[PDB]
Each structure stands twice: as C-alpha cells, then as structure tokens.
Amino acid sequence: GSDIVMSQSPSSLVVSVGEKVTMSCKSSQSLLYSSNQKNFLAWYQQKPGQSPKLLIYWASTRESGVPDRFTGSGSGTDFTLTISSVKAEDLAVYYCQQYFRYRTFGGGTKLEIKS
Amino acid sequence: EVCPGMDIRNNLTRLHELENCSVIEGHLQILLMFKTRPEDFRDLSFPKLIMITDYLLLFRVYGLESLKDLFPNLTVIRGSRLFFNYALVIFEMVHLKELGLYNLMNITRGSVRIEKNNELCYLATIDWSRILDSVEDNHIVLNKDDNEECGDICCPATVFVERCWTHSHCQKVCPTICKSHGCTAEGLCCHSECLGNCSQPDDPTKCVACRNFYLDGRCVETCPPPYYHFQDWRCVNFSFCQDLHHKCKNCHQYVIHNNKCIPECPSGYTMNSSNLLCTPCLGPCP
Amino acid sequence: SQVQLKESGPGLVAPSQSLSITCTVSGFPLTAYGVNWVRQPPGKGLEWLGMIWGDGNTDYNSALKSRLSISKDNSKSQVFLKMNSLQTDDTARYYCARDPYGSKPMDYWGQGTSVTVSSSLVP
Amino acid sequence: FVNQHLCGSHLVEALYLVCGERGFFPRRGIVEQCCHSICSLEQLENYCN
Amino acid sequence: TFEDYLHNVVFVPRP
Ligand SMILES: *[C@@H]1O[C@H](CO[C@@H]2O[C@@H](C)[C@@H](O)[C@@H](O)[C@@H]2O)[C@@H](O[C@@H]2O[C@H](CO)[C@@H](O[C@@H]3O[C@H](CO)[C@@H](O)[C@H](O)[C@@H]3O)[C@H](O)[C@H]2NC(C)=O)[C@H](O)[C@H]1NC(C)=O
Ligand SMILES: *[C@@H]1O[C@H](CO[C@@H]2O[C@@H](C)[C@@H](O)[C@@H](O)[C@@H]2O)[C@@H](O[C@@H]2O[C@H](CO)[C@@H](O[C@@H]3O[C@H](CO)[C@@H](O)[C@H](O)[C@@H]3O)[C@H](O)[C@H]2NC(C)=O)[C@H](O)[C@H]1NC(C)=O
Ligand SMILES: *[C@@H]1O[C@H](CO[C@@H]2O[C@@H](C)[C@@H](O)[C@@H](O)[C@@H]2O)[C@@H](O[C@@H]2O[C@H](CO)[C@@H](O)[C@H](O)[C@H]2NC(C)=O)[C@H](O)[C@H]1NC(C)=O
Ligand SMILES: *[C@@H]1O[C@H](CO)[C@@H](O[C@@H]2O[C@H](CO)[C@@H](O)[C@H](O)[C@H]2NC(C)=O)[C@H](O)[C@H]1NC(C)=O
Ligand SMILES: *[C@@H]1O[C@H](CO)[C@@H](O)[C@H](O)[C@H]1NC(C)=O
C-alpha cells in the first residue's frame, strides 16, 4: 500500500574524538521479513565530497571492510547506529534506508567532531 | 532449462525428454527396464543435468552399470520432497557396478537408501559425511560388499580410508573454510551463496547451484518483495504463481502464504478468492 | 572485473525541461542486478527516485512517479533516467547504484552527476 | 497363471510376466491387494500398459 | 517395509 516513512534523530550531533555516538532511525512499518526473520534496513555513511558508502545491512550485518566500532541494532520499526569511539575520519552524514518494498532514506544525522 | 518431475519406465524412449534440462523441479524416477542392455547406455549422456529439487530414484534398470556417463555433472539433490525420507534411492539395480556420481557435492535434505544391488561396488570408498549431514539415517545394505569382496581401487583419505567414486574418479574435497559452497580446481572458495561448485570464485552469478534461492541468474539469500519463494529453490512473481493456479483450474491450484507460492493452504487456512492469499478459517475450513 | 558505474548528464537544464542521464555500468551483468537512481540536492539528504530490476521491471518514488522514466539496455550495459517538467527543486547530484536485491542494499555507487535547473543560463 | 501371495521380488518378477511387451502403467495399494490378499491375472493386468 | 512402500508408489493401476 502507502509508501514507508523514515525518520532520523538527532538531525545533527557534535562529539569529541573517543566518545560513544548513538543515532536513531524510525520506520512507519515493520521492516522485518517473515521469511528469514531479518530487517530490511541499511546504514550509509557519506563523507564530504564523496558518494555514500554502505556500512550495515540486515539491521546489524557489517559490510566488508567496515570497522567493529560501527554497530547497527534494532528490529521492526526502531533502529540505532552506534560508534563506540568516534574517530576524526567519522565526520560524515549517516543515513538509514529501508529496502523492504522500494527504498526510502531517512533525513540523515550530521556527525561533527569537537577539537 | 528447468524441467518438471519425470517418471521414465519400461524402455529408454521417453528418456530423451531430459536432453535440455539443467534443473529437474521435482523428482526423477527411472525404473522397470527389463530388456535394456549396456549397449543401450553406451553413448547416452545428460551433461546438462546439474540439480534435482526432490529425489532421485533408480529401481530395476537392467544393463545400467554406472551413472558416471548418464549424470556426470549432477551436483545437488535438494531433497525438498523425499521418497520415504530418502533423497537418493538405488534399489534392485541388478547390473550397477559403481554409482559414479563423481560431481555429487551435496544432498541438502534427506538420506540415501542403497539396497539389493548385487553387483554394486565403490560404496565403501564414498565419504557421505561430506555430501549429507544426516548420514546416520542412510541404509546401505545387501550390495556386493555384504555378500562378497569388492576390489575397490582409486586421492583424498578421511577417517584413514581413501575416497573415490570409480577406479578413475576421486571424491572432490574442498578446504574446510569453503564449507558446502564449493571451490575451484585451484582450491579457491566459491561465493558464500553458491552450493557444491562454481565456474569462478567470489561471484554469485558464477554458481552451479544456490545455497538458498535462485533469481535472475543469481544466487540470492532470500526472495525479496515482490517475489515469492517457489519449490524452496527459486523466486517467482505473482503472475507466474497465478498462471499455475489457473492452469490447474482446467495437479495443484497454487496459493500465496508467508511469501511462498505453495500448492495448498496450510491447516486452519482457506484461499481468499482473487489475491491467492491464504486467510485463517473462521471456525471450520470449507 | 572491477564493479563500477558512470553517470553522463546535461550539467545545466532550463525549468519545465526534461533531464536525461545515462548510467554506464561495468564488472557485473545488468540482467542479475538492479540499478537505482538517487538524487541529492545541495546541502540536503538522499532521495530515492526509482529502480530497475534485472527482469526490466521498474519501481518509482510515488511522489515523483508522474515525471519519472527508467529503462535500460542490457547489451550496452546502460540504464537511463528521464525526469520531466523540471523545477529549481530538481537541482541535485544524481547517482546510480547497484542493487544486489535479495542479498544486499545499494552497494556500488557512481561518482554522481551535478544537475542545475536554472533560468539564468548564458552561452 | 497360479493364484498366490506376491510380495517383494516375487511380485515384481510376476507382474513383469503378466505385463510382458505392454509394460507397466498412510496410503495402500498393490501390496495390500496382491501380497496381503491374493490377485487374479485380471487384477494384476490392471497394472499393465 | 520400505520395499512395500516403493511397490505401492511405483505400481499404479489404469483408471
Ligand atoms: C512474471 O514472470 C513471468 C515469468 O517469468 C519467467 O519465469 C520466472 C520464474 C523466471 O524464470 C523468469 O526469468 C522467466 O521469464 C514473466 O513472463 C515472461 O516474460 C519474459 C519477458 O520479460 C518473456 O520472454 C520473452 O518471450 C517471448 C515470447 O515467448 C520471446 O519472443 C522473447 O525472446 C522472450 O524470451 C517470457 O516468455 C514470459 N513468460 C511467461 C510465462 O509469460 C512476466 O514478464 C512477469 N510479469 C511481471 C508483472 O513482472
Ligand atoms: C519403446 O516403447 C514405445 C512405447 O509404446 C509401447 O507400445 C505401445 C503400443 C504401448 O503398449 C506402450 O505401453 C509401450 O511402451 C514404443 O513405441 C511405439 O512403437 C509403435 C511401432 O513403431 C508405434 O506405432 C506408431 O504409430 C505412429 C502413429 O501414432 C506411426 O507414426 C508409426 O509409424 C508407428 O506405426 C507406437 O505408437 C509407439 N508408441 C509411442 C508412444 O511412441 C517403442 O517402439 C519401444 N521400443 C523398444 C525398442 O522397445
Ligand atoms: C531440446 O533442444 C533442441 C534444440 O533446439 C532448442 O529448442 C528450440 C525450441 C529453441 O529454443 C532453440 O533455440 C534451441 O536450440 C530441440 O530441437 C529443436 O526442435 C524444434 C522443434 O520442436 C526444431 O524446430 C529445431 O530445429 C530443433 N533444433 C535442432 C538444433 O535440431 C529439442 O526439441 C528440445 N527437446 C525437448 C524435449 O524439449
Ligand atoms: C565445477 O565446475 C567446473 C566448470 O564450471 C568443472 O570444470 C571442468 O570439468 C571438466 C570435467 O567435468 C574438465 O574437463 C574441465 O577441464 C574443467 N574445467 C576447469 C576450468 O576446471 C568442474 O569439473 C566442476 N566440478 C568439480 C567437482 O570441480
Ligand atoms: C549441504 O548443503 C547444506 C545447505 O547449504 C548445508 O547446510 C550442509 O551442511 C551441506 N552438507 C555437507 C555435508 O557439507
């Protein structure tokens, strides 16, 4: 039926290097597939002046190369992305995306780093 | 080409209906051929047949001495539907001397029953533990070894006994890390979505068979919406499922339940006429 | 062997016009993988436009469906975007990305192509 | 033909004679019919062609 | 037996 809505919180975050960062994602409908019991939810990272990069898929599965500091969690409609110890290279906009029926990207969370 | 299930009996005539199959979506029964001679099977070959989704049954096929020429590239028996809990049945194959299914890498579900084949050797040399998980439920009795000594000569060895299919074919063994995925002749693992073999490594479009689902020339983990899981091996659309339902309306009239295109609604469900969707029964089922 | 995607576009388009972008892919078959069209307005978020499945079927952003057209040519390893009656809100970088549907979300992206909808164009 | 219980290999070698050139055509069938009980040449011929 | 099952499945009558 109607198209899936994605919401992200907060819109922007400022943290110091070495701190934990948690960003949220909300879905208008459950993204949990009854077939494999996996959530059709992905996290992308877009660094300034570069195209987006896949970090997490299936809500919690890390893409090849992605460090263990990046951790996706959640099920159904409520999801989070966690960075255990934020590095200077983590300056980027993080988007969640549903890929259940069609695709929808969330607003994005701007991750800024304190000096 | 995907072919439906087949029962071939009495004489080899109808066997040529397999010439273009690479996958049999169902079972394959070749039986009751009493006047067939080895002569008849000399140049008979089905190199295209890669996979059987249900079971393979061979019973009373006279003159057939090996399966090495008939099915040289049969890699997987999926065991979706089984013959009395068996995916492979070799019974009273009176002239069979060896199995020779040297490309058989995986029996996804079900066990093996090999019984009353008085000329059958090269069974002791087969490490089924690398093909099946449920080896405990295999029933391999009353063959040439149970009543005589087989001069089984062959190569990989496992516990230590050497593993082969025939006098000239070893059993293929991939590195432990490759799991059931298969590997190349160089020992490089096939993609994690492959099953048994592949033409190239780390590519899910280069598989011989899929660990999960087949879609659009690729081995996928799941059939994504709008697709449906069909015959537990491939993805199909709504139209395909609908056209099977109506093709049988003139055999099963297919339904949609839990993202699957299934032959019949499950217990406590009935078909909501139009969308093929299985809906729960308000009280009894009509 | 290297999976890559390259967009070709107009640069500058006048309002009420149509935009035509070509995604030329390499390193994978267009018959087994989907290709999405995602745009990103300057300083704003990613917006999904539509997708073209291996079988040639298409899905569009319902809010933009009326003005969108995706097609492809498997033999030429090309996917095409056509977006009509452009307004200044359509000024964005337009990306194409591979869709390993059933296994992964959009993995490989193109470098994108900047499209500016302007009524202040000069030769 | 001689009427008797036809079970296992005996059933198969008997049915083949009955069929000849024509050839063959919690569920219960031929075993309950011809092994547990006895079959006529006519009853066995119903399995041929 | 299994042989009984096989026989019962394989040997089908004419309708
Ligand atoms: C729903 O799916 C059907 C069936 O698709 C077929 O079965 C699937 C399980 C997969 O194995 C598919 O790869 C396979 O095609 C689609 O119908 C089929 O469409 C294709 C084109 O997209 C047709 O191919 C053409 O057929 C003509 C005439 O025979 C030839 O001249 C062409 O060279 C070409 O091969 C195919 O025949 C057709 N088959 C059937 C059963 O109708 C259908 O497109 C799809 N529907 C939707 C809504 O997506
Ligand atoms: C392999 O078995 C097939 C199948 O048919 C067999 O005989 C039938 C009469 C039945 O009793 C079946 O149960 C049995 O399996 C044999 O093929 C048959 O051969 C005859 C003689 O050639 C065919 O007659 C033909 O009729 C057609 C017209 O319909 C003409 O074009 C031909 O010139 C010829 O007169 C008969 O139709 C055919 N049956 C089929 C289904 O093809 C086959 O000969 C046999 N081979 C061996 C070596 O055992
Ligand atoms: C098995 O395949 C052969 C080879 O032809 C294929 O099938 C055609 C229908 C088409 O898809 C071709 O591109 C394939 O190469 C079949 O033989 C053909 O039979 C048709 C008549 O049915 C005839 O017009 C063709 O000339 C034949 N081709 C050749 C090269 O002789 C054969 O019928 C198929 N067998 C079964 C059981 O399906
Ligand atoms: C795995 O698949 C490959 C092809 O996809 C098979 O490789 C060929 O096998 C034949 C014999 O069956 C040889 O004549 C060729 O030389 C082989 N080619 C290559 C490139 O190796 C292979 O046999 C399949 N099975 C196994 C168990 O490896
Ligand atoms: C056969 O394939 C299945 C599915 O991939 C796998 O789980 C199983 O362990 C494989 N069998 C063996 C013995 O490797």
PDB file of N, CA and C in Angstrom, chain A residues 3 5 9 17 21 36 45 49-50 52 59 65 75 83 92 106:
ATOM      1  N   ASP A   3       3.451   4.429   0.882  1.00  0.00           N
ATOM      2  CA  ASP A   3       4.917   4.428   0.948  1.00  0.00           C
ATOM      3  C   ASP A   3       5.481   4.541   2.386  1.00  0.00           C
ATOM      4  N   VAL A   5       7.769   5.596   5.527  1.00  0.00           N
ATOM      5  CA  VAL A   5       8.383   6.818   6.023  1.00  0.00           C
ATOM      6  C   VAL A   5       9.538   6.484   6.947  1.00  0.00           C
ATOM      7  N   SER A   9      16.963  10.714  14.080  1.00  0.00           N
ATOM      8  CA  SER A   9      17.195  11.573  15.214  1.00  0.00           C
ATOM      9  C   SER A   9      18.575  11.297  15.816  1.00  0.00           C
ATOM     10  N   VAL A  17      36.407  13.333  19.892  1.00  0.00           N
ATOM     11  CA  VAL A  17      37.089  12.114  19.463  1.00  0.00           C
ATOM     12  C   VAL A  17      37.216  11.225  20.688  1.00  0.00           C
ATOM     13  N   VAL A  21      28.759   7.427  20.223  1.00  0.00           N
ATOM     14  CA  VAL A  21      27.733   8.139  19.478  1.00  0.00           C
ATOM     15  C   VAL A  21      26.602   7.180  19.127  1.00  0.00           C
ATOM     16  N   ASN A  36      12.972 -14.819   6.415  1.00  0.00           N
ATOM     17  CA  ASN A  36      14.276 -15.050   7.038  1.00  0.00           C
ATOM     18  C   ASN A  36      14.448 -14.439   8.437  1.00  0.00           C
ATOM     19  N   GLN A  45      27.042   5.855   5.108  1.00  0.00           N
ATOM     20  CA  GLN A  45      27.907   6.950   5.605  1.00  0.00           C
ATOM     21  C   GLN A  45      28.366   7.736   4.413  1.00  0.00           C
ATOM     22  N   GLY A  49      32.036  15.419   0.037  1.00  0.00           N
ATOM     23  CA  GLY A  49      32.502  15.351  -1.353  1.00  0.00           C
ATOM     24  C   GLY A  49      32.817  13.971  -1.903  1.00  0.00           C
ATOM     25  N   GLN A  50      32.113  12.972  -1.376  1.00  0.00           N
ATOM     26  CA  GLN A  50      32.226  11.579  -1.761  1.00  0.00           C
ATOM     27  C   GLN A  50      30.809  11.032  -1.851  1.00  0.00           C
ATOM     28  N   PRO A  52      27.789   8.064  -1.164  1.00  0.00           N
ATOM     29  CA  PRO A  52      27.501   7.241   0.040  1.00  0.00           C
ATOM     30  C   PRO A  52      28.150   5.848   0.018  1.00  0.00           C
ATOM     31  N   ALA A  59      19.951  -4.770   9.249  1.00  0.00           N
ATOM     32  CA  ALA A  59      19.908  -4.000  10.505  1.00  0.00           C
ATOM     33  C   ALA A  59      21.181  -4.033  11.338  1.00  0.00           C
ATOM     34  N   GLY A  65      34.946  -4.698   5.259  1.00  0.00           N
ATOM     35  CA  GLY A  65      35.820  -3.545   5.452  1.00  0.00           C
ATOM     36  C   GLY A  65      35.435  -2.638   6.605  1.00  0.00           C
ATOM     37  N   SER A  75      15.024  -3.844  15.652  1.00  0.00           N
ATOM     38  CA  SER A  75      14.110  -4.735  14.941  1.00  0.00           C
ATOM     39  C   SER A  75      12.749  -4.062  14.769  1.00  0.00           C
ATOM     40  N   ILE A  83      28.644   4.196  17.286  1.00  0.00           N
ATOM     41  CA  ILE A  83      30.079   4.315  17.030  1.00  0.00           C
ATOM     42  C   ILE A  83      30.678   4.334  18.415  1.00  0.00           C
ATOM     43  N   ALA A  92      30.991  12.755   8.793  1.00  0.00           N
ATOM     44  CA  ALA A  92      30.122  12.346   7.703  1.00  0.00           C
ATOM     45  C   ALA A  92      28.652  12.561   8.105  1.00  0.00           C
ATOM     46  N   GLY A 106      16.302   8.036   5.268  1.00  0.00           N
ATOM     47  CA  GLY A 106      15.979   8.911   6.384  1.00  0.00           C
ATOM     48  C   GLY A 106      16.637  10.245   6.159  1.00  0.00           C
TER      49      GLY A 106
END
